[PDB]
Design a binder for this molecule. Structure first.
Ligand SMILES: CN(Cc1ccc(F)cc1-c1ccc(C(=O)O)c(Cl)c1)C(=O)c1cc2ccc(Cl)cc2[nH]1
Ligand SMILES: CN(Cc1ccc(F)cc1-c1ccc(C(=O)O)c(Cl)c1)C(=O)c1cc2ccc(Cl)cc2[nH]1
Ligand SMILES: CN(Cc1ccc(F)cc1-c1ccc(C(=O)O)c(Cl)c1)C(=O)c1cc2ccc(Cl)cc2[nH]1
Ligand SMILES: CN(Cc1ccc(F)cc1-c1ccc(C(=O)O)c(Cl)c1)C(=O)c1cc2ccc(Cl)cc2[nH]1
Ligand SMILES: Cc1cc2nc3c(=O)[nH]c(=O)nc-3n(C[C@H](O)[C@H](O)[C@H](O)COP(=O)(O)O)c2cc1C
Ligand SMILES: Cc1cc2nc3c(=O)[nH]c(=O)nc-3n(C[C@H](O)[C@H](O)[C@H](O)COP(=O)(O)O)c2cc1C
Ligand SMILES: Cc1cc2nc3c(=O)[nH]c(=O)nc-3n(C[C@H](O)[C@H](O)[C@H](O)COP(=O)(O)O)c2cc1C
Ligand SMILES: Cc1cc2nc3c(=O)[nH]c(=O)nc-3n(C[C@H](O)[C@H](O)[C@H](O)COP(=O)(O)O)c2cc1C
Lengths: 325, 325, 325, 325
C-alpha cells in the first residue's frame, strides 16, 4: 500500500497484525487520557516561522551524549519487536545504521545484546535497563553493554510496577518496586558509561538526577502506558529544561509522529527525541525496510519543517519559534 | 461477563436492569451538565508523579473521624439498594466488613438500622440523616444509630426539595424545606456522635459548619441530582479545604470511578472519598460479591496510582502531585 | 405528547409545524454562531448554592419599571404569532394575564394594539416599537399604546437592516437605517411612558441610553438573528450592569430555556429576563394553554433553582451565586 | 443550484470538479491543523456593535497602496485557474474590473501578464512574484508588470520549498531556497513599484520588511499550504500591526469566507483582505459570472456587517468592535 506519513503506517499495521498484537502495541493505561494528550499537546504549540533566512543547505546533524547522529530523531526502547516482524531488533538496528541515528535496545528484547551489536556493528547503540530485584543480572547486562560497544545506559525509573492497560506475574518477579535514589548511586558507581534517567516528569526529580551524576534526562510518560492522567511530555519539557540549567542534555519521547513535533521539542530545549510506536509500525509493514521508511519520513518531514521555519541547522532552532495557544 | 473497571460494571448493569431502574440510578438533574462535569473535572487535574521513592510496601490505611479504615474509599448513601439486588444494604454492609471500609446507610434504605448493624456487626457504619418535618422521627433515627453502634451522622443539607431528574409528593411530606443553621444547632445538641455536613459547595458555608461544632464536611453535589450547573466536587474541594483551615476533615463524593480520582482528591486535601453509583452497579452484577469486586478494583487502582506516583502511604500524598490544566 | 421542559416543546413544534415555519422561528443569522452561544454561555456560568437558609416560602414576585409581576420571567416580542396558532398574540396575552407576568407586543404582530388590550385588559402589556421611516406611523403606535393602557415602550435599536438568515423589501420600506441618538431624543420627548432600549451590547451605548433619559436597557442580540458573532447576552450582561451604575433596570433575553438561566441572569444583576422562541413553541403545542404551560415550567424551574440555591426571594439573589468557568 | 454564501459555492465545486482537482484546491499541509484554524480563529473573535449611528449611506470604498478600490476585499494569487474554468485568470480579471476591486495575478498563472492586462485594461492589477533561481526570469516578469500597467509586486517569502499536502521536481528547479533579505534589497532596487512581503507571520520579520523599504505586509500562511501548525492569520495580525507602527499597510489572507471576517480583520488594523479559494469556487460554478457572484456576496455581507456594527464607512471601523473570547 501507499504510505506517506506515520499515521498511514499505523493504519497499515492495524490491517495486517492480529487484533491482540496491534492492541498491545497501541494501548495506553486505563482510560488512555495521556495517550490522547501526548498527540493533542503537540497541536496546541504553534510555530512562528522566520522568512528569508537562506535554507538551501539544511543540516539535520547533532550529537547525543557526545556521539554524532544524522538527525535529532532516535529509536526508543520497545519490548518484543519480533512480534511485529521475524527480524525484530536486528531489522531495527540495521535501519538505524543506514540512517546514521541511534537505537535504544529494550531490556525485554527478542534479540540478545550481542546479536544486536553484531547486526549493527557501526550503529550507535544504547541499552535501556531496569534495576531488577536480581542486581547480579542488572550488573551482567551493564557489563555486556560496555563490552559490546553500547555508548550509554538509559535507566527506566517510572515502572516500579506495570501500568494497567500471568505475564505480569513473571515481570513482577523481575521489576523491583523498592528502587530509590540510593540504587541510582549504585548504578552510577557501577559504570563510567553515560547514564540517562528515563521517565522523569518533575523538575525536582530532574534536579536530583543531576545531583546524582547522571548525564541526561529523557522526559517520558512511557508512551502513556504507566500512570494515566500525567501531562503530555511536550507540556512538561519546558519545566525540566528550566530545572536542569544546562547541566545535562534533555530528551523527549511520547507522541512524536511528524517533523513539526521534532521541531517543537527542539525549540523548547530538547537535544533530540525518541520514537516508540512508529518503529513497530515500520517493522509490521516491512521489517528493516519499513523501519528505514518511517525514519526517512520523519527525517524529511523534519528537514522541511526546519527549512520552512528559517532554520538551516539545529543550532539556530530557538524558543521564539513556538508559543502555546 | 469480564468486568475489569467500574465503567464495565455500569455497562453490565445497563444490560441486566430494567431501563427505568438503570435510568433512575444513572440520572442527574435537568440537562445533566454537572453529572458530565463530575467525571470531566477529574480528567483536567493532571498528576505529577515522583520517581525512585521506594513503593515496595504500599499502605492504603487511614482514619475517618478517628476510626481506622483499610483505604480512603468508603460507601456513600444510595436509596433503595434492594431495587438492584434482593440483599440490598445487607449485601453492601457485608462487603464493607470484608474490605475493612465504612458504609454510610441511606435515610431511604430498604433495610432497617438494626438489620444492617446485625448483618455487619464488625463493619464501620454511619447513618445519613435528613432533618425531617417530623423531628420526633429524626431524633428516633439518631438514638437508634447510637444504640446500634453507628460511629457518625452525615446530615444531608442540599435537599430542601428534590431535584428535577406521586413518589415525590410522599417525600415532600418528609423533607423539611425550612431547615436552617438553627436546626443544625439542635442536631449538634441532640447527639455526641461526630456529625458531618453533606452537600456543602461554598467555603463560607463550610466555615459556618465548623462554627456550629460539626466534625467534618462532605463536599458533594448529591451525585449531580439536585441543582444542575453547580461545579464538579473536585473543582470546589480546594476552596473548602482552604476555608476550614484544618479544623475538620473534608471528604468528597461525585464522579469517583478510578484509583487516580481518589489520589487527586487526597492530593487536594480530602481525607477520604465516597462512592455512590459504583456500589449500585456492584449490587446489580452480583450482590455482596459484586460490591466487594467494585471496592477491590478501586482499592488496587488506588494502590497502583499511589505506587506509580511515589507514595508509600496516604500521609505523603501532597498538593504538588496535582495541577489543573 | 408528554412535555416536561422547554426543549420538549421545541421538539414537539418541529414535529407539527411545516418545516419552513419551524425553520423561520428557529433560525439565527449566517453560520448561527451566536445562536449556539446564547445557550452554551449559560452552561459556562456555574452556580454556588447556599445551604440551610430556610426556603419553605419562596416568593418569585418582583417589579419591572415600577409594575409588580409574579416572576422575573416575561414574554418578549416575536413577530407573526398567528403562524404558530390561530389565536396568536391573543392566546399569548391571555396566558400572561393568568400567570401575572408581562407581554411585550411585537411591532409586526398579527393582532392590533387594541385587540390585544381587549383580550388581556388586566395583563401587564408593553409595546415593542421601531422608529419607522414614517414617523407619523411611529407616533400613532405610541399614542395607541398610551390610550390602550400599555405601561412601557421597548424601542428596538439593533435592526437598521434585517440580519441575513421580497418580504425583506417590504420591511426595508418601513425600517429606517438612519436612526441615531437624535431620534431617541425625539422619542423621549414624544411620550412620558417608560422607554427601554432593546438590543444594546456595549457599556458605552448603555451609558448613552441613560444620558438620553431612557428608563431601562434590554441586553439582547435579537435572538442571534441580527449580527452573527456577537457575544452571548449572559456574557455581556455584567459589563452593561457595571456601566449603568444602578441608574436604570437592566433586562436580558437570548437563550433563556431553564429556571437556572433566570437565576444566573438575576445573580449577574438583571431585574428580569424575556423569552422569545419558547412562547412560539407553547403556541405551536396548544395556543393559550401551551403558552401557559411553558411559562409555568419556567416559573417552577426558577422556584426550584432559587430554593436549592438558598434564596427565599429575588432580593437575596446576589453575585456570589455565580462564577464563570 | 441556489448558492447564497461562500460555503455553498465550495459545496457546488466539490459536486462538479473531479475529486483530484477539488482536493488540490481544498487541501492544506500535513494534518491540516492550520487549515481548520484559519476559519475557527475568526469565530473566536467576537463583535461588539454600536447602535444608533446612522448607517443609511454605507460606503465600502478604501485604498490599497494608494489606488482606490470599491471594497477592502481583493482577489489573492491562486495558481492554474484554468483547471477550474476554461477562461481561468481572464474570467477573474473581468470580474474584478466589474466589481472595482484588485486582482493579484499568480506567478503560476494559466494566462500571461499581457493576456490578463488586455482582458482587464481598466482593472486594478498586481503581480505576485517569487525570486526564482533564474534571476533573469524574475527581472523579466517585474519589467512586464511595469510595462503592462500592474500597480504593485507581491513577493511571496514563505515558500523556500513547497509544503507537503514529479510536478514538485519541476517547481523545485524554479523556487530558490537560498533567498534572504539581501535578495529583498535587490528586488527593492530593481523596481519603483510598491512591493508587499507576502507570507510574514512574525513581528520581527515585519519590522525587517519595513527597514528594507517595502511598502506593505500581507499576513499570510499561504492558505495553510506551507508549514502546518502556524497560527491562524487573524490571530497573528494584531502583533504585526503593532510591530509596523503605521509605517506600511498590513493586509490579511487565510480563512476569509464571510463579511464578518472582513470586518474583524479591519477592526484589528488590516487595510484590506485577500481571498484565495472562494474565487476558485466562483470559477468552478460559472467562470467570470461565478467570480462576480462570490465577490458580490462578500461585498454585501461586509456592507451588512458594517451597518449592523454602526459603521457608515471603513474609516470608523476601530479596535473596540472586537474582543477575543
Ligand atoms: C506484562 N506484559 C508485557 C511483557 C510480557 C513479557 C515480558 F517478558 C515483558 C513484558 C514487558 C513489556 C514492556 C515493558 C516496558 O518496559 O514497557 C515491560 Cl516492564 C515488560 C504483558 O502482559 C503482555 C505482553 C504481550 C504480548 C503480546 C500480546 Cl497480544 C499481549 C501482551 N501482554
Ligand atoms: C422521589 N423518588 C425517589 C424516592 C422515592 C421514594 C422514597 F421513599 C424515597 C425516594 C428518595 C430517593 C433518594 C433521595 C436522596 O436523598 O437522593 C431522596 Cl431525598 C428520596 C422517585 O421519584 C423515585 C424512586 C424510584 C425508584 C425506581 C424508579 Cl424506576 C423510579 C423512581 N423514582
Ligand atoms: C423579512 N421577513 C420577516 C418579516 C416579514 C414580513 C413582515 F411584515 C415582518 C417581518 C419581520 C419579522 C421580524 C422582525 C424582527 O423584528 O425580528 C422584523 Cl424587523 C420584520 C421574512 O423574510 C419572513 C417572514 C416569514 C414568515 C414565514 C416564513 Cl416560512 C418565512 C418568513 N420570512
Ligand atoms: C507542485 N504542484 C503545484 C504546481 C504544479 C505545477 C506548477 F507549474 C506550479 C505549481 C505550483 C502551484 C502553487 C504554488 C504556490 O505558490 O502555492 C506553487 Cl509554488 C507552485 C503540484 O504537485 C500540483 C499541481 C496540481 C494540479 C492539479 C492536481 Cl489534481 C494536482 C496538482 N498537484
Ligand atoms: C509496545 C511498547 C513497548 C515498550 N517497551 C518498553 C521497554 O521495554 N522499556 C522501556 O523503557 N520503555 C518501553 N516502552 C516505552 C517507550 O520506550 C517510549 O517511552 C514510548 O514508546 C514513547 O512514546 P511513543 O510510542 O508515542 O513514541 C514501550 C512502549 C511501547 C508502546
Ligand atoms: C440513586 C441515588 C440515590 C441516592 N440516594 C441518597 C440518599 O438517600 N441520601 C443522600 O444523602 N444522598 C443520596 N444520593 C447521593 C449520594 O450519597 C452521593 O452524594 C452521590 O451518589 C455521589 O456521586 P457518585 O454517584 O458519582 O459516586 C444518592 C445518589 C444516587 C445516584
Ligand atoms: C421568530 C422571531 C421573531 C422576532 N420578532 C421580533 C420583533 O418583531 N421585534 C423585536 O424587537 N424582536 C423580535 N425578535 C427578537 C426577540 O424579541 C428576542 O430578542 C429573542 O427572541 C430572544 O431570544 P430567545 O428567542 O432565545 O428567547 C424575534 C425573535 C424571533 C425568534
Ligand atoms: C490552490 C491554491 C493555489 C495557490 N497558489 C498560489 C500562488 O501561485 N502564489 C502565491 O503566492 N500563493 C498562492 N496560494 C496562496 C494564496 O495566495 C492565499 O495566500 C491563500 O489562498 C489564502 O487563503 P484562502 O484560500 O483561505 O482565502 C495558493 C492557494 C491555493 C489554495
Amino acid at each position: 500500500p501507499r504510505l506517506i506519513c506515520i499515521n498511514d503506517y499505523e493504519q497499515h499495521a492495524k490491517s495486517v497484525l492480529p487484533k491482540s498484537i496491534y492492541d498491545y502495541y497501541r494501548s495506553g493505561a486505563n482510560d488512555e487520557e495521556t495517550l490522547a494528550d501526548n498527540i493533542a499537546a503537540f497541536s496546541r504549540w504553534k510555530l512562528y516561522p522566520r522568512m528569508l533566512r537562506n535554507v538551501a543547505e539544511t543540516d539535520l546533524s547533532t550529537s547525543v551524549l557526545g556521539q554524532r547522529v544524522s538527525m535529532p530523531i532516535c529509536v526508543g526502547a520497545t519490548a518484543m519487536q519480533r512480534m511485529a516482524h521475524v527480524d525484530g531488533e536486528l531489522a531495527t538496528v540495521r535501519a538505524c545504521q543506514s540512517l546514521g541515528t541511534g537505537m535504544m535496545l529494550s531490556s525485554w528484547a527478542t534479540s540478545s545484546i550481542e546479536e544486536v551489536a553484531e547486526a549493527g556493528p557501526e550503529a550507535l547503540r544504547w541499552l535501556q535497563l531496569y534495576i531488577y530485584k536480581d542486581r547480579e543480572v542488572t550488573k551482567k547486562l551493564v557489563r555486556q553493554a560496555e563490552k559490546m560497544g553500547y555508548k550509554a545506559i538509559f535507566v527506566t525509573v517510572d515502572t516500579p510496577y506495570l501500568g494497567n492497560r500471568g505475564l505480569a506475574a513473571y515481570v513482577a518477579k523481575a521489576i523491583d518496586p523498592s528502587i530509590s535514589w540510593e540504587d541510582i548511586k549504585w548504578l552510577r558507581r557501577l559504570t563510567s558509561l553515560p547514564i540517562v534517567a528515563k521517565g522523569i516528569l518533575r523538575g525536582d526529580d530532574a534536579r536530583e538526577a543531576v545531583k546524582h551524576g547522571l548525564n541526561g534526562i529523557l522526559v517520558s510518560n512511557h508512551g502513556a502506558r504507566q500512570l494515566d492522567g500525567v501531562p503530555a511530555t511536550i507540556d512538561v519539557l519546558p519545566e525540566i529544561v528550566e530545572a536542569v540549567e544546562g547541566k545535562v542534555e534533555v530528551f523527549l519521547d511520547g507522541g512524536v509522529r511528524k517533523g513539526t513535533d521534532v521541531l517543537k521539542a527542539l525549540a523548547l530545549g530538547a537535544k533530540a527525541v525518541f520514537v516508540g510506536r512508529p518503529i513497530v509500525w515500520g517493522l509490521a509493514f516491512q521489517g528493516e525496510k519499513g523501519v528505514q521508511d518511517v525514519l526517512e519520513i520523519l527525517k524529511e518531514e523534519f528537514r522541511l519543517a526546519m527549512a520552512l521555519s528559517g532554520c538551516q541547522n539545529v543550532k539556530v532552532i530557538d524558543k521564539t519559534l513556538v508559543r502555546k495557544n
